[PDB]
Amino acid sequence: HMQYDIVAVTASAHDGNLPENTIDGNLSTRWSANGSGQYITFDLGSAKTVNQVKAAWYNGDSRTSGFSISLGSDPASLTEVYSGTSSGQTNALESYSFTATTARYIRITGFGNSSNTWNSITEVAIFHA
Numbered sequence: 081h082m083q084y085d086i087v088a089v090t091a092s093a094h095d096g097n098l099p100e101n102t103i104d105g106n107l108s109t110r111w112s113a114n115g116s117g118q119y120i121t122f123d124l125g126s127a128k129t130v131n132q133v134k135a136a137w138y139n140g141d142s143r144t145s146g147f148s149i150s151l152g153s154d155p156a157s158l159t160e161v162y163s164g165t166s167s168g169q170t171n172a173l174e175s176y177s178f179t180a181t182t183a184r185y186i187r188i189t190g191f192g193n194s195s196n197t198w199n200s201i202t203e204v205a206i207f208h209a
């Protein structure tokens with residue numbers, strides 16, 4: 081089981097809850113961006129075999145959040161590998177697994193949540209599981 085370093089994080093938008101808060105190891109710090117279609121992009125630094133993305137959701141034990149995962153070598157031309165809704169049943173890292181493929185960049189696109197239009201993520205980790 082491999083956990084890859086995330087060398088950089090960017091995002092479409094944020095409200096002062098920075099993108100890099102998703103890789104600080106702290107469930108009390110988050111990235112937040114308001115509105116369906118906002119996204120956050122994780123850079124592995126080079127192309128790696130990836131088959132699993134874990135995300136911990138803000139208020140993750142009290143609301144469900146819609147999202148998709150896309151990956152690839154070109155941020156402008158990523159491929160969607162996963163689409164779903166967070167469980168609403170834990171604040172912990174939740175695993176979203178998919179057929180193994182190569183990627184330098186992993187993007188999470190959020191569609192808001194069952195309470196409001198925000199996309200708020202406390203932690204992300206990216207694996208070859």
Ligand SMILES: O=C(O)C1=C[C@H](O)[C@H](O)[C@H](O[C@H]2[C@H](O)[C@H](O)[C@H](O)O[C@H]2C(=O)O)O1
Nearest residue numbers: 095097112113138139195196197198199200
């Ligand atoms: O994910 C959130 O719910 C969230 C993220 C933002 O960082 C901010 O805290 C946001 O707050 C909104 C939200 O609707 C919340 O329910 C409450 O109404 O405050 C407003 C706000 O803009 O402060 O919540």
Ligand SMILES: [Ca+2]
Nearest residue numbers: 101106109202
């Ligand atoms: Ca955090």
Ligand code: NA
Nearest residue numbers: 094095113114
């Ligand atoms: Na925002």
